[PDB]
Amino acid sequence: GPHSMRYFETAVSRPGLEEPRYISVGYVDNKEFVRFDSDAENPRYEPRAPWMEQEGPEYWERETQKAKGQEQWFRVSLRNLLGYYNQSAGGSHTLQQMSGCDLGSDWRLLRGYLQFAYEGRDYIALNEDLKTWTAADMAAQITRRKWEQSGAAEHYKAYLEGECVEWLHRYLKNGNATLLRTDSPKAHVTHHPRSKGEVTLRCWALGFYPADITLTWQLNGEELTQDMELVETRPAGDGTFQKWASVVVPLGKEQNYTCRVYHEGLPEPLTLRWEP
């Protein structure tokens, strides 16, 4: 299947003892594999997965250096943003950055990603062409202008199309004990008395990965996309995920209701019904 690598970087400031905390988490196929925390005793990208442990100091050293580098960049962009929004000093602010690349099932590039966020809101992001920007607001305009007159977009275009892809391949080649794998959702429904002559059916999906998944209830072919109960997909804590959907079905008329469970790891969608 397809793959990807992202580096989510956050810099968060608090008042008093200046110097914001810088954090960088990187993922390959949305699985954490490296982490950096300026708050550590000894700041330095740590491996975060058995496989990635086969890298060697030369590497970690080079990465830790880069993280030290980002830290400074954020540290300053943060002082600048502070001025752009005319926010009084002594506050607590956040600068966020998502960067990375996507690969087809063939391993070739498909897209580059580089976007920023200030205070949790979109600030400026590199467009698909990797040549033009998009500034969410007036303050971001200033930033965008500055970044155009310096062709800084080329710099990111180079990394996203190159190093990003070159290393993802490398990573994909090493760690091959879960990355060339996924978990199929096991399913089942549960009966719950709900009211006067009515009940509630709960379509449960458990132990699946990746987290993308879809549940739906049907009453005579038609999908019940109303009065249905969901729940944001959540981590079982072991690496797999869970989610459930439910509906209120007049007692005795259980069988007239079925739920399909759509998920990539699944050969074909699952079909469920209450089993008394």
Binding site: Y7, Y45, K66, A67, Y84, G100, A152
Partner: peptide, 10 residues
Amino acid sequence: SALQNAASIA
């Protein structure tokens, strides 16, 4: 490997 931002900052 980590990305390093442009010299151009916010």
